[PDB]
Design a binder for this molecule. Structure first.
Ligand SMILES: CCO[C@@H](Cc1ccc(OCc2csc(-c3ccc(Cl)cc3)n2)cc1C)C(=O)O
Lengths: 246, 8
C-alpha cells in the first residue's frame, strides 16, 4: 500500500531538482537580462542563442526528471520501453509545471538563480521567437496563483509522468494502477495542506489538461522554428522526445 | 529512443 508514497516522491523531488519553489521564491522575492548587451555579458544570432539556451535547460531538466521517475515506487519495475514512452510524453508537461516556480509577472530565473531575464525583453525578440515564453508566463501566473508548495508539486509531477493514456503503452493496466495510487495520495495531501481551498484538486486536474495543450502548441512553434530558421538545430535528446508527437 | 533509453 501507499502510506510511504508521498514521502518517497517528495524526497525524490528535493534530491533530484537543482531548482525548487522555496529556492526560486527567495531569490525572486541575480544579473538582469533586459537587452542585447546584458545577454552577451551573461553568455551566432541572438534569438537563436536563446533558443539554444532553453534546450540546454530542458536537457538538464529531463536528466533530473529521469532520476526522479526511477525513484517513483513501481516505475523502475515497468518495461524499459514503457519508461521511455512515459518520460517521452510527460517530460515537457512536467518542465512547464515546474518552470512556473521561477516565473513572476516581470520575468524568470535562469542560470540556476544567478540570472534573471525579463518578460519584456523576451516579448521583444523577432518573430517567431517572441512567441516562445509569453504563453508560459500566461500559464505560470494562473498556476502560481494556486499557491502550491513543493510537496504538492512533487505529487503533481509524479502524476503527470505515470499517465496511463500515453500512446503506445504496453502495460496500461499497471500504469493506470500506479496513477490511481498517486492521484489518491495527492487528493489527500491537498486536503490537509490546503484545507480552505475546496476545489484545489479539481483545479489541478484542469491544469494537467492545460499543460497538454501548452506542450502541443509549444512543439508546434518549435517545429516551425526548426524548419524555417537556418541556425536552429535541436539537441538529439529533444529531437527524440519531439519525434512522432503531433 | 537511444538517449532517453540511455538515461533510463
Ligand atoms: C525553444 C526550446 O524550449 C525548450 C523548453 C524550454 C526550456 C527552458 C525555457 O526557459 C528557461 C530559459 C528561458 S530563457 C533562458 C536563458 C536565457 C538567456 C541566457 Cl544567457 C540563459 C538562459 N532560460 C523555456 C522553454 C520553453 C524546448 O523546447 O526544449
Amino acid at each position: 500500500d501507499l502510506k510511504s508514497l508521498a514521502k518517497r516522491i517528495y524526497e525524490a523531488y528535493l534530491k533530484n531538482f537543482n531548482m525548487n519553489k522555496v529556492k526560486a521564491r527567495v531569490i525572486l522575492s541575480p544579473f538582469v537580462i533586459h537587452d542585447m548587451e546584458t545577454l552577451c555579458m551573461a553568455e551566432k544570432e541572438a534569438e537563436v542563442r536563446i533558443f539554444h539556451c532553453c534546450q540546454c535547460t530542458s536537457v538538464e531538466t529531463v536528466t533530473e526528471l529521469t532520476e526522479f521517475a526511477k525513484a517513483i515506487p513501481g516505475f523502475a519495475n515497468l518495461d524499459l520501453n514503457d519508461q521511455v514512452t512515459l518520460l517521452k510524453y510527460g517530460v515537457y508537461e512536467a518542465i512547464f509545471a515546474m518552470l512556473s516556480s521561477v516565473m513572476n509577472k516581470d520575468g524568470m530565473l535562469v542560470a540556476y538563480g544567478n540570472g534573471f531575464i525579463t518578460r519584456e525583453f523576451l516579448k521583444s525578440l523577432r518573430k517567431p521567437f517572441c512567441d516562445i515564453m509569453e504563453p508560459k508566463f500566461d500559464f505560470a501566473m494562473k498556476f502560481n496563483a494556486l499557491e502550491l508548495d513543493d510537496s504538492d508539486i512533487s505529487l503533481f509531477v509524479a502524476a503527470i509522468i505515470c499517465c496511463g493514456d500515453r500512446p503506445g503503452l504496453l502495460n496500461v493496466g499497471h500504469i493506470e494502477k500506479m496513477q490511481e495510487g498517486i492521484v489518491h495520495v495527492l487528493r489527500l495531501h491537498l486536503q490537509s495542506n490546503h484545507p480552505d481551498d475546496i476545489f484545489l484538486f479539481p483545479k489541478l486536474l484542469q491544469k494537467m489538461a492545460d499543460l497538454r495543450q501548452l506542450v502541443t502548441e509549444h512543439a508546434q512553434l518549435v517545429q516551425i522554428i526548426k524548419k524555417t530558421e537556418s541556425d536552429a538545430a535541436l539537441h538529439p535528446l529533444l529531437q527524440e522526445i519531439y519525434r512522432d508527437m503531433y | 529512443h537511444q538517449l532517453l533509453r540511455y538515461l533510463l
